[PDB]
Design a protein around this nucleic acid. Structure first.
Ligand code: NA
Lengths: 257, 256
DNA sequence: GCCGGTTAACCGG
DNA sequence: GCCGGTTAACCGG
């Protein structure tokens, strides 16, 4: 984690900072804390200037630093890693259509919010925003299915010391016409017990939890974390399939006749 | 539908409308073309003032004209219909603590953007907005499971002529730092072939379709539409119970 | 004290 | 045409 070292600095520049609210009034999903992410990234881009990238930004740099190679297959080789391609690359069509005149942009799908890279090591930072004027449910963190596939590809290629998936929670509350941050939390996904990750099937097969309450006591290796996750995943998928019937089938049998 | 009769007028007024790019960050989910919904509502209040209501606004006016009521239990009775209570009402604690000095505000999982009410008949209007400059996937229309519960409720309480769930799509495209409505469309859920609605399980069990493409040729009587929907839904759930093994399970067993 | 469903709307390594 | 995952973050008829 290239972030944990200067965490307090982050937490100190964020708490207290007021940012005028979005000219809409919703403050639901994407249209909420969003500007806090911008703040975090801006700080990092100035205090880790060379390690800090926006996912699409990293991709635009990757291809720009290799103008000699065109086509999608040659560009997919620029990742020198399957898992990394899975986690960060754009589609076949898009990858092939990229150019200095047609650069990549933000994409609702992008696995990460900001990218920190140094020494062929990658930190996938996803910043979560939370309105603490409510006591809502744990937000979507990452797709269980995506993580499952990511683990399977760590095992296949044997890439166990290449990337960390970390989370930064930014708590806020409305105050006048502004949103103001009241506190933050940090957590390393691969530092938590995988067998305990809660997967919310209906919620886009996403595992959900508040960064603030996530356990960080895992002791095995990254190879053992992945195995355990795939285990929990299959177990809970088998479980969901059976649980679905008891809730979405039987309760309505008395109508179909 | 109270909108359909005036639809040509709303399409006319919408096409050409512009709204400021909601935020510096790209427009996804709640941060997309939502502002246009405020324009639809505006037009409706302006031409159907006695019928046009925000969902929370309707609940606020309901409890408001019943000052003697008090208490969630007594207040739920005000709905005079179970199926409407299930689709519109708020939490028990939210209902209990309601007061003119503590009104309902919009909630994220409401159900409907706009409520057109008249003569005990309820039209639930949902506005879908879409970035037409690209070809994206059908958007989340409504929860398949929530629909099943409503159908189950309609059938049990035999209330088949109480409400309609309609949809308005308003397409836009980026013009500088403004979003401009370029097209529009409208369809009625209950006029569609229930057995053909696509249920996207992973995507919050949401049926998804582009409004402009929805089929409007159902024949039957609202009850058939419901019986036909529960049928399709259960079948899809069974199916989904299987497919979740061909994926998620069978292909990951190779690992421990 | 637990457990999970719903709004919004996105392309395809 | 058809099919279907993901990001965001929400409380409790
Ligand atoms: Na809407």
């Amino acid at each position: 984690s290239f972030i944990k070292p200067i965490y307090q600095d982050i937490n100190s520049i964020l708490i207290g900072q007021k940012v005028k609210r979005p000219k809409s009034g919703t403050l639901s999903g994407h249209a909420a804390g969003e500007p806090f992410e911008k703040l975090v990234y801006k700080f990092l881009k100035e205090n880790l200037s060379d390690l800090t990238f926006k996912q699409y930004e990293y991709l635009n740099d990757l291809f720009m630093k290799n103008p000699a190679i065109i086509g999608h297959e040659a560009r997919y080789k620029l990742f020198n890693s399957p898992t990394l391609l899975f986690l960060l690359s754009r589609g076949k069509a898009a990858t092939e259509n990229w150019s200095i005149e047609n650069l990549f942009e933000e994409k609702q799908n992008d696995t990460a919010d900001i990218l920190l890279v140094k020494d062929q090591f990658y930190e996938l930072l996803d910043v979560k925003t939370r309105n603490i004027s409510k006591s809502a449910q744990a937000p979507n963190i990452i797709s269980a299915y995506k993580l499952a596939q990511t683990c399977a590809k760590m095992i296949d290629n044997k890439e166990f010391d290449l990337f960390d998936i970390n989370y930064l929670e930014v708590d806020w509350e409305l105050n006048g016409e502004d949103l103001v941050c009241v506190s933050t939390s940090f957590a390393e996904l691969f530092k938590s017990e995988p067998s305990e990750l809660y997967i919310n099937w209906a919620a886009a097969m996403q595992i959900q939890f508040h960064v603030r309450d996530l356990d960080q006591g895992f002791n095995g290796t990254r190879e053992e974390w992945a195995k355990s996750y795939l285990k929990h995943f299959v177990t809970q998928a088998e479980q969901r399939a059976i649980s679905m019937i008891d809730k979405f089938v039987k309760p309505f049998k008395k109508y179909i006749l």
